[PDB]
Write an enzyme that holds these catalytic residues in place. Structure first.
Site, PDB file in Angstrom:
ATOM      1  N   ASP A   1      33.601  31.257  38.980  1.00  0.00           N
ATOM      2  CA  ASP A   1      33.485  31.859  40.193  1.00  0.00           C
ATOM      3  C   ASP A   1      32.515  33.113  40.492  1.00  0.00           C
ATOM      4  OD1 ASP A   1      34.727  29.924  41.513  1.00  0.00           O
ATOM      5  OD2 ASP A   1      36.624  31.061  41.800  1.00  0.00           O
TER       6      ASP A   1
HETATM    7  N1  LIG Z   1      49.411  39.826  46.591  1.00  0.00           N
HETATM    8  C1  LIG Z   1      49.108  39.807  45.342  1.00  0.00           C
HETATM    9  N2  LIG Z   1      50.144  40.360  44.482  1.00  0.00           N
HETATM   10  C2  LIG Z   1      49.835  40.564  43.322  1.00  0.00           C
HETATM   11  N3  LIG Z   1      48.809  40.126  42.627  1.00  0.00           N
HETATM   12  C3  LIG Z   1      47.624  39.408  43.679  1.00  0.00           C
HETATM   13  C4  LIG Z   1      48.011  39.546  44.881  1.00  0.00           C
HETATM   14  N4  LIG Z   1      46.803  38.896  45.298  1.00  0.00           N
HETATM   15  C5  LIG Z   1      46.059  38.578  44.598  1.00  0.00           C
HETATM   16  N5  LIG Z   1      46.570  39.035  43.070  1.00  0.00           N
HETATM   17  C6  LIG Z   1      46.059  38.811  42.032  1.00  0.00           C
HETATM   18  O1  LIG Z   1      44.898  38.313  41.993  1.00  0.00           O
HETATM   19  C7  LIG Z   1      44.650  37.223  41.340  1.00  0.00           C
HETATM   20  C8  LIG Z   1      44.267  35.636  41.999  1.00  0.00           C
HETATM   21  O2  LIG Z   1      44.021  36.185  43.418  1.00  0.00           O
HETATM   22  P1  LIG Z   1      42.593  35.470  44.146  1.00  0.00           P
HETATM   23  O3  LIG Z   1      42.683  35.207  45.458  1.00  0.00           O
HETATM   24  O4  LIG Z   1      41.458  36.201  43.557  1.00  0.00           O
HETATM   25  O5  LIG Z   1      42.505  34.208  43.501  1.00  0.00           O
HETATM   26  P2  LIG Z   1      41.706  33.016  43.610  1.00  0.00           P
HETATM   27  O6  LIG Z   1      42.238  31.546  43.228  1.00  0.00           O
HETATM   28  O7  LIG Z   1      40.213  33.359  43.288  1.00  0.00           O
HETATM   29  O8  LIG Z   1      41.216  32.781  45.357  1.00  0.00           O
HETATM   30  P3  LIG Z   1      40.921  31.728  45.856  1.00  0.00           P
HETATM   31  O9  LIG Z   1      42.162  30.977  45.713  1.00  0.00           O
HETATM   32  O10 LIG Z   1      40.245  31.349  47.228  1.00  0.00           O
HETATM   33  O11 LIG Z   1      39.852  30.859  44.841  1.00  0.00           O
HETATM   34  C9  LIG Z   1      45.757  36.848  40.494  1.00  0.00           C
HETATM   35  O12 LIG Z   1      45.431  37.634  39.060  1.00  0.00           O
HETATM   36  C10 LIG Z   1      46.820  37.619  41.247  1.00  0.00           C
HETATM   37  O13 LIG Z   1      47.788  38.187  40.175  1.00  0.00           O
HETATM   38 MN   LIG Z   2      38.742  33.529  42.356  1.00  0.00          MN
END
Ligand SMILES: Nc1ncnc2c1ncn2[C@@H]1O[C@H](COP(=O)(O)OP(=O)(O)OP(=O)(O)O)[C@@H](O)[C@H]1O
Ligand SMILES: [Mn+2]
Ligand SMILES: [Mn+2]
Ligand SMILES: [Zn+2]
Ligand SMILES: [Zn+2]
Ligand SMILES: [Zn+2]
Lengths: 56, 32, 126, 56, 65, 84, 43, 263
Positions: C4
């Site tokens: 990504d």
């Molecule tokens: N509310 C939260 N509390 C703790 N950690 C969080 C939180 N939101 C995100 N994270 C951290 O961010 C990361 C994943 O969040 P993120 O939204 O970037 O996932 P993603 O899969 O990229 O998003 P998408 O789901 O759109 O692809 C993990 O390492 C997670 O622990």
């Molecule tokens: Mn991501």
DNA sequence: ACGTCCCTCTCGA
RNA sequence: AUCGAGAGGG
């Protein structure tokens, strides 16, 4: 940060542009990605501690 | 007799901007 | 662009692509203290470690000045007891516009607008 | 829970993290501007003195 | 915010052909994708440069000073 | 008030934590301008300087493993193993 | 020195002397580019 | 005749078309590649501003000037400011330019590339001219002024290669193809039911031939004959942008030898 | 009874 | 500066 595998030590490799850069295959144990994620960095002020961070 | 004064919202009743047109809004430095 | 991320054609942003354009703004007021004991804006002689010399004697800096680091913008002074207002530690731009006038009380009031552009640098969100 | 079982720390860092196929597992691409402000006590020892005096 | 000089994608001089594009679609009254196509743009990269441009400079000028 | 070696029981191998504190410890000392024993084959670095010492068990150090009740079995770096 | 707005007077007025578009009438007032030249890269 | 032989296809004001027979892909690529960004050209580099009431910022217009194409025909007669001797720049290393525009027109009033003007010594070399491809001949719309807007800035125009910045981009788009009927199998296709009748014959398959399905694949099939079409904004003519493509490469390889025989 | 970890901004007595 | 409230970032 809820486990050991998410606070590993590294060797430095000073580079350009403002971004920390890490090997694709140490993603997971941190569950990190490359779309907005910051990351921390510390640095031991001694020798023994470096050893502690190098050999552990 | 006097009371005080009341924050007014833009584009409302008792505001000038209600009154303006493209031309006017411009020299009012206000956004069309 | 692994995991990504997005590798982006430098030469194409060299042509100006996704080029931002930023603006901060700083405010201040000559803050009286009762007995018509007023503040002001000056160039002085406890003071702060900036580099005022980019000022004009009136307590200011004027458009076109390429400012950086922690260089004073506004040189306010209070009963000497410095009160100037320096640049933002993080940022490094170029003065754009500034406005003087008076508050509801009728004392001086200076808001400084400094521009700058931003550029698609490796590590910027999209 | 705030000022003992945890505090904040000198010598710490932060930034956007991107990923690097041309890098090794165990090293981390830290930018200059961190390496210019990230210090590290080091003693004066005959094995390095001929180095420290070129960094100073 | 005005026409940008040439094309982001292959960098071909396109700053010029702007005002000339206007009358093509207006003065001659023709199809958009025929006005660009007949200004010498077959790469849809350049084509995307003109067709999706908003000339907010005009709203700008319209201001007091 | 102590244990005699003849009756020792604890791991005769050296622990990740013993070692890494030992490599660490001496390495700090060495770089504090301490007398080194093994013969430098050309090492500016003191972690390595110590590590060579480690691979010649020329390190004058005793680990003092403590037990839950209080007493401790001493163990020479000369005598601990090193596998890991 | 200091300018205006609704009209854009070329005013000027050193220290201590009040503030108003005395030619017009709106305490807005700017501050004009120092004749100092500045330079930017064409990149 | 020689070696890597060629045959133009078409030629024109802005584009040129040619098959490089008996050329190695690694070459036609590496040539293509230097054509893009490694041929020298001129383009505004610094710009100081005295008066700019326009809506677009100072450095806004700044970035815009750097991208105006300059004449570069004879350009090797100018030598890289950085590699010359004059405390900063001179006439040996840089063309200088200046742009006055004031909103006298009560309509809406335009500034162009035409409106630029050269205020240094030309020394009798074709340099610094802002190409006009324009039909109206009026150049490139740089800015717009309401009756009362002014613009006074001046432009030091130095020699650069796109490797440093796109503006010193002599090139534009460079067409590249080869082996139209995928006879070398250099690319696995993508089809739902038929590959053939879904991937359209490129506009080049008529200068090569169909493959006679019945026959097998030849494993000695080598890359040769390349269909290219190069185009220049105009800063440099299109023959020079191809040939000073070749030229630059030679010099590139060249300085290998040069520093080879130093050691 | 405490009620996931950290981080970047912006604003009123 | 300090406490209080507010929107976003993983
Ligand atoms: N509310 C939260 N509390 C703790 N950690 C969080 C939180 N939101 C995100 N994270 C951290 O961010 C990361 C994943 O969040 P993120 O939204 O970037 O996932 P993603 O899969 O990229 O998003 P998408 O789901 O759109 O692809 C993990 O390492 C997670 O622990
Ligand atoms: Mn991501
Ligand atoms: Mn994420
Ligand atoms: Zn294009
Ligand atoms: Zn006025
Ligand atoms: Zn020179």
């Amino acid at each position: 940060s809820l486990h050991k595998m998410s606070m590993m030590a590294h060797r430095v490799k000073v580079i350009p542009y403002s971004t920390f850069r890490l090997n694709l295959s140490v993603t997971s144990p941190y569950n990190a990605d490359f779309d907005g994620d910051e990351m921390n960095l510390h640095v031991p002020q001694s020798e023994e501690t470096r050893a502690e961070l190098s050999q552990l | 007799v006097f009371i005080g004064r009341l924050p007014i919202m833009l584009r409302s009743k008792n505001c000038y901007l209600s009154e303006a047109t493209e031309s006017d809004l411009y020299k009012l430095k206000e956004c069309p | 662009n692994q995991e990504d991320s997005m590798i982006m054609n430098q030469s194409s942003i060299d042509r100006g692509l996704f080029r931002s354009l930023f603006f901060r703004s700083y405010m201040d007021q000559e803050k009286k203290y009762g007995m018509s004991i007023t503040e002001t804006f000056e160039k002085p002689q406890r003071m702060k470690h900036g580099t005022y010399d980019k000022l004009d004697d009136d307590g200011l800096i004027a458009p076109g000045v390429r400012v950086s680091g922690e260089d004073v913008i506004i040189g306010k002074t209070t009963p000497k007891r410095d009160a100037s207002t320096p640049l933002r530690s993080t940022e490094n731009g170029i003065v754009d516009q500034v406005l003087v006038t008076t508050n509801q009380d009728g004392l001086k009031f200076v808001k400084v607008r400094v521009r700058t552009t931003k550029i698609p640098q490796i590590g910027d969100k999209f | 829970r705030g000022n003992l079982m945890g505090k904040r720390v000198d010598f710490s860092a932060r930034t956007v993290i991107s990923g690097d196929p041309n890098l090794e597992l165990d090293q981390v691409g830290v930018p200059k501007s961190i390496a210019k402000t990230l210090t590290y006590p080091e003693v004066v020892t005959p094995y390095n003195i001929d180095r420290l005096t070129q960094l100073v | 915010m005005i026409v940008p000089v040439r094309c982001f994608s292959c960098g071909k001089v396109v700053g010029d052909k702007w005002e000339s594009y206007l009358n093509l679609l207006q003065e001659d009254e023709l199809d958009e994708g025929t006005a660009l196509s007949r200004l010498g743009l077959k790469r849809y990269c350049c084509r995307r440069m003109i067709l999706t441009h908003v000339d907010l400079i005009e709203k700008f000028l319209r201001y007091n000073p | 008030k102590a244990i005699p070696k003849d009756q020792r029981a604890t791991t005769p191998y050296m622990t990740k934590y013993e070692r890494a504190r030992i490599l660490g410890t001496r390495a700090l000392q060495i770089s504090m301008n301490a007398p080194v024993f093994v013969d430098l084959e050309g090492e500016t670095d003191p972690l390595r300087i110590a590590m060579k010492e480690l691979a010649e068990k020329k390190i004058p150090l005793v680990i003092r493993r403590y037990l839950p009740d209080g007493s401790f079995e001493d163990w020479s770096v000369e005598e601990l193993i090193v596998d890991l | 020195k200091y300018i205006c707005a609704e009209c854009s007077s070329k005013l000027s007025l050193s220290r201590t002397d009040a503030v108003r578009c005395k030619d017009c009438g709106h305490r807005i007032l700017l501050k004009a580019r120092t004749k100092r030249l500045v330079q930017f890269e064409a990149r | 005749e020689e070696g890597p032989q060629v045959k133009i296809r078409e030629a024109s004001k802005d584009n040129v078309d040619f098959i490089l027979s008996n050329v190695d892909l690694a070459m036609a690529n590496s040539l293509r590649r230097v054509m893009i960004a490694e041929i020298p050209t001129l383009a505004i580099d610094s710009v100081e501003v005295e008066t700019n009431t326009t809506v677009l910022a100072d450095e806004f217009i700044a970035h815009r000037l750097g991208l105006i194409p300059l004449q570069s025909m004879d350009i090797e007669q100018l030598e890289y400011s950085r590699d010359c001797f004059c405390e900063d720049h001179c006439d040996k290393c840089s063309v200088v330019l200046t742009l006055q525009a004031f909103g006298e027109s009560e309509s809406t009033t335009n500034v162009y590339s035409k409106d630029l003007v050269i205020v240094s010594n030309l020394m009798g070399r074709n340099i610094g001219h802002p190409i006009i491809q324009d039909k109206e001949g009026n150049g490139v719309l740089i800015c717009k002024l309401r009756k009362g807007q002014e613009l006074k800035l001046t432009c030091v125009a130095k020699k650069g290669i796109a490797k440093e910045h796109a503006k010193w981009g002599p090139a534009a788009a460079i067409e590249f193809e080869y082996d139209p009927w995928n006879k070398l199998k250099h690319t696995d296709y993508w089809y739902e039911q038929d590959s053939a009748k879904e991937w359209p014959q490129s506009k080049n398959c008529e200068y090569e031939d169909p493959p006679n399905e019945g026959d097998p694949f030849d494993y000695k099939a080598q890359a040769d004959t390349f269909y290219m079409n190069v185009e220049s904004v105009g800063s440099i003519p299109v023959d020079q942008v191809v040939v000073r493509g070749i030229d630059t490469l030679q010099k590139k390889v060249a300085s290998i030898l040069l520093a080879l025989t130093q050691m």
